[PDB]
Amino acid sequence: APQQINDIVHRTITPLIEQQKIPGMAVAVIYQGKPYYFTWGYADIAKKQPVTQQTLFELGSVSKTFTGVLGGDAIARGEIKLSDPTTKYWPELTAKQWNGITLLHLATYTAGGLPLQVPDEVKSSSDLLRFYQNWQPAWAPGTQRLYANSSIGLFGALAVKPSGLSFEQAMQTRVFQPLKLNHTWINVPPAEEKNYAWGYREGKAVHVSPGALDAEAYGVKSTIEDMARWVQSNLKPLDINEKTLQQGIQLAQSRYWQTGDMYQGLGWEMLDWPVNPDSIINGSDNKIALAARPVKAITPPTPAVRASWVHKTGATGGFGSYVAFIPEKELGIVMLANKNYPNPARVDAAWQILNALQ
Ligand SMILES: CCN1C(=O)CC(=O)N(CC)C1=S
Ligand SMILES: CCN1C(=O)CC(=O)N(CC)C1=S
Numbered sequence: 001a002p003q004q005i006n007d008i009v010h011r012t013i014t015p016l017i018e019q020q021k022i023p024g025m026a027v028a029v030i031y032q033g034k035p036y037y038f039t040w041g042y043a044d045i046a047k048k049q050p051v052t053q054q055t056l057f058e059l060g061s062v063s064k065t066f067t068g069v070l071g072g073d074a075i076a077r078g079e080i081k082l083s084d085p086t087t088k089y090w091p092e093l094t095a096k097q098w099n100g101i102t103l104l105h106l107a108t109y110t111a112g113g114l115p116l117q118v119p120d121e122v123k124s125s126s127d128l129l130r131f132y133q134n135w136q137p138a139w140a141p142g143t144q145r146l147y148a149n150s151s152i153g154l155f156g157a158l159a160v161k162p163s164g165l166s167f168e169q170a171m172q173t174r175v176f177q178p179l180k181l182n183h184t185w186i187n188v189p190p191a192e193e194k195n196y197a198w199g200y201r202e203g204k205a206v207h208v209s210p211g212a213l214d215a216e217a218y219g220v221k222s223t224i225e226d227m228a229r230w231v232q233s234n235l236k237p238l239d240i241n242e243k244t245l246q247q248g249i250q251l252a253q254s255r256y257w258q259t260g261d262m263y264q265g266l267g268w269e270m271l272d273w274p275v276n277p278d279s280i281i282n283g284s285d286n287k288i289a290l291a292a293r294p295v296k297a298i299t300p301p302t303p304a305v306r307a308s309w310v311h312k313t314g315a316t317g318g319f320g321s322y323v324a325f326i327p328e329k330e331l332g333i334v335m336l337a338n339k340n341y342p343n344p345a346r347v348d349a350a351w352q353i354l355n356a357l358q
Pocket of ligand 2: 060061116149218315316317
């Protein structure tokens with residue numbers, strides 16, 4: 001790799017790992033469309049297993065970008081419309097507050113205050129129905145963005161209903177496989193378990209627990225190589241042969257809502273490039289990222305803007321991940337770690353690295 005890339009990455013990531021006490025980390029830098037890989041530390045401390053390019057990390061919320069793209073693919077297939085009412089795909093949802101709440105609203109956290117987490121008490125499908133039936137919005141639909149697994153999670157579930165496929169099957173066959181993401185999983189098969197890093201929370205080794213709509217909201221695990229390929233795909237959607245997937249990716253980066261200087265896509269979030277680093281750094285802090293904020297409707301949505309900082313932070317109990325890229329520049333980065341460390345530290349490192357290379 002170019003010594004510039006090596007120095008920039010190492011000078012940035014080494015202190016980050018030290019300061020944040022990150023056990024293991026993998027980084028991919030996409031420079032002029034080509035990936036460059038870097039690994040540090042341990043995937044499994046007790047077994048002294050190092051991080052490698054084949055190490056599986058929990059993506060957490062970065063999963064929502066796959067979910068967004070899968071939804072976009074379903075739109076392109078004509079199987080769903082984002083303008084349709086939610087009740088069209090879930091007739092049992094008869095409570096009156098669901099009037100006027102569309103798939104768009106679910107996909108973009110603008111339904112009116114759906115909670116961050118689906119309650120752990122929800123186990124069966126009937127529990128799930130009861131939950132959404134009894135949910136009372138704090139706001140009118142399409143007025144406030146509140147980041148929520150219960151929102152985009154339900155979107156994912158409904159988006160694949162007409163296809164007849166389970167969410168996992170739709171994702172595998174319509175997204176993972178055509179993009180040759182051969183080491184990306186919703187459920188890690190035993191054959192791949194040896195590469196599945198442990199997460200670390202408070203010194204304890206942890207993996208993500210099963211939960212309602214987990215697959216749809218935070219259930220993807222991937223390697224640094226597949227995630228680099230994921231970024232390449234989202235950098236250059238036109239190079240992709242499957243028409244609907246190609247279109248789906250474009251739709252996922254459309255700008256549907258604005259709050260502050262940020263735009264909400266399907267899973268992906270975007271800002272105009274060049275960005276104010278303080279804005280994306282401070283904005284990633286949960287006190288802002290998880291806050292209720294008013295939205296300006298983008299009518300109609302702006303098609304994917306090449307001059308954008310496109311990104312997503314992700315977390316599970318034991319993992320912290322970040323993906324960012326700039327389509328106009330053929331420039332991107334993936335940061336995968338088996339510790340959930342503060343978002344602003346992730347974004348700061350990413351902007352430091354990409355800015356030096358642009
Ligand atoms: C649905 C119309 N539309 C958009 O709003 C944005 C976009 O990028 N594209 C192209 C795939 C379309 S068709
Ligand atoms: C349910 C997954 N998960 C976590 O475990 C921890 C966390 O901070 N976040 C982000 C809100 C998520 S989605």
